[PDB]
Write an enzyme that holds these catalytic residues in place. Structure first.
Site, PDB file in Angstrom:
ATOM      1  N   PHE A  92      -6.426   4.636   6.979  1.00 44.28           N
ATOM      2  CA  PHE A  92      -5.704   3.758   7.893  1.00 44.28           C
ATOM      3  C   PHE A  92      -6.840   2.810   8.695  1.00 44.28           C
ATOM      4  O   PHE A  92      -6.448   2.307   9.452  1.00 44.28           O
ATOM      5  CB  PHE A  92      -4.659   4.138   8.594  1.00 44.28           C
ATOM      6  CG  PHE A  92      -3.846   4.732   8.421  1.00 44.28           C
ATOM      7  CD1 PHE A  92      -2.762   4.137   7.592  1.00 44.28           C
ATOM      8  CD2 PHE A  92      -3.496   5.775   7.228  1.00 44.28           C
ATOM      9  CE1 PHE A  92      -1.573   4.319   6.515  1.00 44.28           C
ATOM     10  CE2 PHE A  92      -2.687   6.777   6.981  1.00 44.28           C
ATOM     11  CZ  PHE A  92      -1.487   5.996   6.077  1.00 44.28           C
ATOM     12  N   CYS A 133      -4.519   0.325  11.272  1.00 45.10           N
ATOM     13  CA  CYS A 133      -2.951   0.321  11.277  1.00 45.10           C
ATOM     14  C   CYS A 133      -1.845   0.635  11.943  1.00 45.10           C
ATOM     15  O   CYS A 133      -2.056   1.851  12.320  1.00 45.10           O
ATOM     16  CB  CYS A 133      -2.477   1.473   9.356  1.00 45.10           C
ATOM     17  SG  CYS A 133      -1.353   1.148   9.101  1.00 45.10           S
ATOM     18  N   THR A 173       1.186  -1.371  -0.093  1.00 46.17           N
ATOM     19  CA  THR A 173      -0.029   0.079   0.357  1.00 46.17           C
ATOM     20  C   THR A 173       0.417   1.648  -0.056  1.00 46.17           C
ATOM     21  O   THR A 173       0.391   2.065  -0.330  1.00 46.17           O
ATOM     22  CB  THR A 173      -0.779  -0.389   0.616  1.00 46.17           C
ATOM     23  OG1 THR A 173      -0.039  -0.405   1.571  1.00 46.17           O
ATOM     24  CG2 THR A 173      -1.959  -1.382   1.079  1.00 46.17           C
TER      25      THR A 173
END
Ligand code: HEM
Ligand SMILES: CCCCCCCCCCCCCCCC(=O)NCC(=O)O
Length: 454
Positions: A389, A396, A264
């Site tokens: 996120f 994340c 990502t």
């Protein structure tokens, strides 16, 4: 209120709408047509796609919803197991991993990774300075070399040496094929048709390649003093239980962090460069900041933290094209969403992040424009409006790692080169669950500023 739903295909319901190589972009187009929520039905499964901040903010309430494994993540779990990304919150190994690995993302840890991030960023700058006049740069390809190399080195003290290969690294080739197959299995109505036998054989061979790489990482570490992410995986104890991870789970974590820890980020750097070249005034501002701030032969950790505008550019790229573009929740108990939509315990919701990030009731009318000034004062942005996120305790864990790496590299790129969109590239977004531009090429003219030693 009855929930809108896109067109159907008889007993396959909505499933064939996923029969496309760009499923997320197809869903975004459906959300545009149908609005803040729609139902998507397949044989034996239903999910509801959310696009407005008003409903997503409710879905982000952890007392009412928990992380769900979407069907995409369930397929990824075939090779990522109960690693931190594909575990349920209620599985013992999720909290134990999170507790053991969190320290690897502290500020003190980040300061410690900085020199190894520079090592790889210098390899990237050197490669581009070394190109001949007639050459150009394949952006997402080089950004994947940089980001894989960086998680390898900082996380595992392992050199992929991706800048020594003109083709993708073999881990990348198998990872991409494996994420591709996951994405493709989403529209398969009969996954056990023998017509998929070779898809299955190739999936297993891809997983064996990833696991052979994990073997080398583990063996190189045995043969090697480091205190990095792999150190905590192998030896760290969970403070709650006092137990370390088991060997099977550790292999899942290494696969997890090598994939989540670079794919990502490569997408983000690719999209940020795309938007910079497409918005010359923004690129001028960012390049001015890079020149003013990065006064030393290589950047220090403090200097990176000072690249405010570069950080705004990366956030505004994550706003338009968040590279892990959805996350999924389930209802902990019966509840009513938005005062309008009754859900039963266990009902699944999918948050369509690019659509949330285009909610004009939050951002104003001009949501398609690339305007980093949106993020000048991040504390002014409403809670749950900006979620590249993910959310809450399942957000994340590597968000600061990714942003520090991307800001360092983009700052060095902008210090060292002027960039030309020499083919007037038309954005073409390749999907492999995650999003990245495909075919994006540029030309980079060196400013001939000498680059310090690693
Ligand atoms: C720009 C880059 C990144 C983006 C956009 C991103 C996005 C996300 C998102 C959306 C989730 C939530 C997934 C869900 O709810 O199903 C997540 C979780 C996660 N990410 Fe990131 N990520 C990035 C970089 C990283 C990096 C650099 C690492 C590792 C070094 C990483 C490791 C993880 C892990 C292990 C999880 C699971 C966390 C947990 O549930 O405990 N990610 N990421
Ligand atoms: C092991 C680490 C995995 C890292 C990659 C994670 C992928 C991120 C998930 C992005 C979401 C993909 C959405 C795919 C399209 C979709 O909505 N499918 C429905 C479904 O999945 O059930």
């Amino acid at each position: 209120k009855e929930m809108p739903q896109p067109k159907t295909f008889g007993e396959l319901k909505n499933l064939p709408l996923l029969n496309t190589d760009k499923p997320v972009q197809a869903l975004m187009k459906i959300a545009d047509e149908l609005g803040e929520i729609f139902k998507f039905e397949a044989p034996g499964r239903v999910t509801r796609y959310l696009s407005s901040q008003r409903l997503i903010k409710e879905a982000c309430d952890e007392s009412r919803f928990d992380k769900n494994l979407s069907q995409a993540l369930k397929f990824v779990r075939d090779f990522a197991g109960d690693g931190e990304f594909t575990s349920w919150t209620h599985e013992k190994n999720w909290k134990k991993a999170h507790n053991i690995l969190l320290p690897s993302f502290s500020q003190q840890a980040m300061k410690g990774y900085h020199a190894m991030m520079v090592d790889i960023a210098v390899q990237l700058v050197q490669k581009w300075e070394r190109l001949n006049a007639d050459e150009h740069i394949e952006v997402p390809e080089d950004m994947t070399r940089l980001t894989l190399d960086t998680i390898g080195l900082c996380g595992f003290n392992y050199r992929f040496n991706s800048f020594y290969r003109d083709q993708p690294h073999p881990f990348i080739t198998s990872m991409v094929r494996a994420l591709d197959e996951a994405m493709n299995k989403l529209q398969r109505a009969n996954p056990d048709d023998p017509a998929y036998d070779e898809n299955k054989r190739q999936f297993q061979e891809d997983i064996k390649v990833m696991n052979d790489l994990v073997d080398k990482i583990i063996a190189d570490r045995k043969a090697s003093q480091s205190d990095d992410l792999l150190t905590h995986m192998l030896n760290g104890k969970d403070p709650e239980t006092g137990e370390p991870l088991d060997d099977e789970n550790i292999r899942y974590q290494i696969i997890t962090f090598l994939i989540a820890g670079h794919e990502t980020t490569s997408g983000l750097l690719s999209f940020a460069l795309y938007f910079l070249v497409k918005n010359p005034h923004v690129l001028q501002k960012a390049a001015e900041e890079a020149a003013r701030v990065l006064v030393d032969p290589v950047p220090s950790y403090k200097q990176v933290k000072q690249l405010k505008y570069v950080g705004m550019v990366l956030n505004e790229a994550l706003r338009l094209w968040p590279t892990a573009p959805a996350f999924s929740l389930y209802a902990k108990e019966d509840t009513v969403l938005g005062g309008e939509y009754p859900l039963e315990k266990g009902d699944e919701l999918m948050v369509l992040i690019p659509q949330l990030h285009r909610d004009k009731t939050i951002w104003g009318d001009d949501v398609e424009e690339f305007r980093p000034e949106r993020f000048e004062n991040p504390s002014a942005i409403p809670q749950h409006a900006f979620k590249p996120f993910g959310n809450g305790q399942r957000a994340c864990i590597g968000q600061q790692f990714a942003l520090h790496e991307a800001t360092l590299v983009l700052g060095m790129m902008l210090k060292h080169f002027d960039f030309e969109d020499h083919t007037n590239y038309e954005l073409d977004i390749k999907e492999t669950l995650t999003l990245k531009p495909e075919g994006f090429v540029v030309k980079a003219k060196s400013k001939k500023i000498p680059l310090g030693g690693i």
